[PDB]
Structure 1
Amino acid sequence: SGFRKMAFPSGKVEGCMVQVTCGTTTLNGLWLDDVVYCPRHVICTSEDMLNPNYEDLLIRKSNHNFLVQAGNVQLRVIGHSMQNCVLKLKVDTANPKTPKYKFVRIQPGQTFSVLACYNGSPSGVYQCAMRPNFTIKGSFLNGSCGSVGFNIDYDCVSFCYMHHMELPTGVHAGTDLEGNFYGPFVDRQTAQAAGTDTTITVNVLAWLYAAVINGDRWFLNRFTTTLNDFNLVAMKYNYEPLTQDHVDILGPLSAQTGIAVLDMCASLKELLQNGMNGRTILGSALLEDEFTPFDVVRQCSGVTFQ
């Protein structure tokens, strides 16, 4: 028992990280097979960033303008192209440590591990959710661009995120691995801001089940409710609406605990109206929304990768 925010083991991804330099701009790249993927703004100076014309900046670049290092060894670039906001560099050597992999575009509410990197070297790993306003609450400094987020399924790494920028309030924005931004952000140093964020209700419900499983059940009350009634109160607290899909997804945790989803919704409702009155749940003094139902099941049944 016990319940922790837990990242995937990072080894398979550590093997893919390289440093990419163009002129005096350095950041991280991801090396899979004979392609290196990185944020396109590697081709910019810090003046260029105010308002870059990426097609004009790029067209004046050739293969040899791109320095790719893996450890202390240089990779030879034999081709380049731009897809949306990522640059792809064809190199002459396949990554010998390429894992089985996929590229996916995740939905809001879905979680993933970030391997934060500097100069092609890993610094640490942590878990994030794609927020409803299409940002993530990360930890990123200058040089972290190109760090990636992923999930693992047994031996298969699904890359879902590449890091590009920080927005007001210290939240983060990036792309999928086809270089399409999550959210309506652009890779330019012009004033931009995320919209009001909401709470990922299905995830809060998953975490409450996690609590009951781990024996922390003081908040279970004697009421039930309906989906509509719940949703009315949800809306007022800037919680995302709960759908039939969400109910279905929570089916396994419902079954494991003997608590019907709608009964747990009534307990959450009461927490929203009354607060926690100084108590904690699974050590937290607020309602956590960055564990998916899948995250909870995985951690509560000890699923394993290789």
Structure 2
Amino acid sequence: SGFRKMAFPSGKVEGCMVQVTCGTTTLNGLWLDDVVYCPRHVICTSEDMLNPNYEDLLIRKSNHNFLVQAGNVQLRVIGHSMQNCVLKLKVDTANPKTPKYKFVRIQPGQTFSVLACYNGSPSGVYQCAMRPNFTIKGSFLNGSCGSVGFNIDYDCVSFCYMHHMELPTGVHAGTDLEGNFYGPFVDRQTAQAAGTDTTITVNVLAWLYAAVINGDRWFLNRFTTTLNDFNLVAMKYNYEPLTQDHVDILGPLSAQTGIAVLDMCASLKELLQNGMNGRTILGSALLEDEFTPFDVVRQCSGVTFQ
């Protein structure tokens, strides 16, 4: 029993983190086979950041302008190129600790673990979700750029996020590992604003199922509803609409608890309209939307990784 915000084990990613220095700027890099991936803004000086021309800035650099350290060892940079908003640094040594990996571009609502790093060294691991407005609510300080987000799928590390910047509201924005931003952001210091955020409905329902599995049942009722009546109420409270795909995804949890998805929707509708009235669910006084249906299954059925 119990239910915690659980991250993947980070060992396989820890051995891929390196430190990258260009000029006076140091941040983190991801070392896989013989390539080091890092945010391209590492080549910017203070003057460049309002409106950098990255092609110009990169053509002015040579291999020896990039200092790459893996612990004490220096890695010799033998080539460099730019893909979208990442820099790719070819080095003379292939990382002997390269895990089996893939690069994946995730969708809003999905969750992943972040390994926060400074100067190439892991500081901590935590779980977060890609919000509907393509920001993440992370925890990052100066020097954290290049820290990555990942999931583990059997024996394979799927990298889905590399950290680039913080917005004035305190939330975070970054790219996939091919350098494409999530969201409408660009890597220059101009005023940019995130869309309004919404609550990830399918995740809230998954977490209400986790609550039932753990014996928290006070919010259940005998009612049922339709997708159409549910979505009408949901849109009024800034909740994402529920689709049939969502209902099918919640299948295994409905089966294991014997509570139909649309029955659980009727409970959520009531919680939205009346609030929780100082009761808690799974130790929370707010409805929690950063667990996916798969996160719940994994943690309530005990899935491991190789």
Q: Same fold (TM over 0.5)?
A: yes
Deviating 4+ runs (over 6 angstroms):
none
SS at 2:20's partner residue? strand
Q: What residue number does 1:265 align with?
A: 265
Q: What residue number does 1:78 align with?
A: 78
The superposition leaves residues 204-251 of structure 1 with CA deviations (integer Å, 9 ceiling, x where unpaired) of 000000000000011101211000000000000000000000000000
What is the Cα deviation at residue 45 of structure 1?
A: 1.2
Q: Following superposition of structure 1 onto structure 2, how do residues 1-306 of structure 1 map, counting pairs within 5 Å?
A: 1-306=1-306
What is the alpha-carbon distance in structure 1 between the residues aligned to residue 64 and residue 7 of structure 2?
37
The superposition leaves residues 224-280 of structure 1 with CA deviations (integer Å, 9 ceiling, x where unpaired) of 100000000000000000000000000000000000000000000000000000110
Between the two proteins, what is the percent identity of the paired residues?
100
What is the alpha-carbon distance in structure 2 between the residues aligned to residue 112 and residue 279 of structure 1?
29
Using the TM superposition, name which of 43-52 and 210-219 deviates more.
43-52
SS at 1:97's partner residue? coil
The superposition leaves residues 34-55 of structure 1 with CA deviations (integer Å, 9 ceiling, x where unpaired) of 0000000010112321211111
What is the Cα deviation at residue 2 of structure 1?
A: 0.5
What is the alpha-carbon distance in structure 2 between the residues aligned to residue 12 and residue 155 of structure 1?
10
What is the alpha-carbon distance in structure 2 between the residues aligned to residue 69 and residue 252 of structure 1?
46
What is the alpha-carbon distance in structure 2 between the residues aligned to residue 6 and residue 232 of structure 1?
33
SS at 2:68's partner residue? strand
What is the Cα deviation at residue 74 of structure 1?
A: 0.3
What is the alpha-carbon distance in structure 1 between the residues aligned to residue 259 and residue 2 of structure 2?
20
The runs of 5 or more residues in structure 1 that have no matched partner are none
The runs of 5 or more residues in structure 2 that have no matched partner are none
What is the alpha-carbon distance in structure 2 between the residues aligned to residue 79 and residue 267 of structure 1?
58
The superposition leaves residues 154-182 of structure 1 with CA deviations (integer Å, 9 ceiling, x where unpaired) of 21000000000001210000000000000
What is the alpha-carbon distance in structure 2 between the residues aligned to residue 253 and residue 38 of structure 1?
39
Q: TM (normalized to structure 2)?
A: 0.99
SS at 1:212's partner residue? helix
What is the alpha-carbon distance in structure 2 between the residues aligned to residue 280 and residue 45 of structure 1?
49
The superposition leaves residues 113-142 of structure 1 with CA deviations (integer Å, 9 ceiling, x where unpaired) of 000000000000000100000000000011
SS at 1:13's partner residue? helix
SS at 1:197's partner residue? coil
The superposition leaves residues 263-306 of structure 1 with CA deviations (integer Å, 9 ceiling, x where unpaired) of 00000000000000011000000000000000000000110112
What is the alpha-carbon distance in structure 2 between the residues aligned to residue 53 and residue 142 of structure 1?
23
The superposition leaves residues 183-213 of structure 1 with CA deviations (integer Å, 9 ceiling, x where unpaired) of 0000011111101100000000000000000
What is the alpha-carbon distance in structure 2 between the residues aligned to residue 190 and residue 7 of structure 1?
33
What is the alpha-carbon distance in structure 1 between the residues aligned to residue 128 and residue 106 of structure 2?
12
SS at 1:90's partner residue? strand
The superposition leaves residues 39-79 of structure 1 with CA deviations (integer Å, 9 ceiling, x where unpaired) of 00010112321211111111100111110000011001111
What is the alpha-carbon distance in structure 2 between the residues aligned to residue 104 and residue 304 of structure 1?
21
Q: TM (normalized to structure 1)?
A: 0.99
What is the alpha-carbon distance in structure 2 between the residues aligned to residue 123 and residue 247 of structure 1?
38
SS at 2:225's partner residue? coil
What is the alpha-carbon distance in structure 2 between the residues aligned to residue 219 and residue 250 of structure 1?
18
What is the alpha-carbon distance in structure 2 between the residues aligned to residue 22 and residue 203 of structure 1?
41
SS at 1:136's partner residue? coil
What is the alpha-carbon distance in structure 1 between the residues aligned to residue 113 and residue 81 of structure 2?
27
What is the alpha-carbon distance in structure 2 between the residues aligned to residue 72 and residue 221 of structure 1?
61
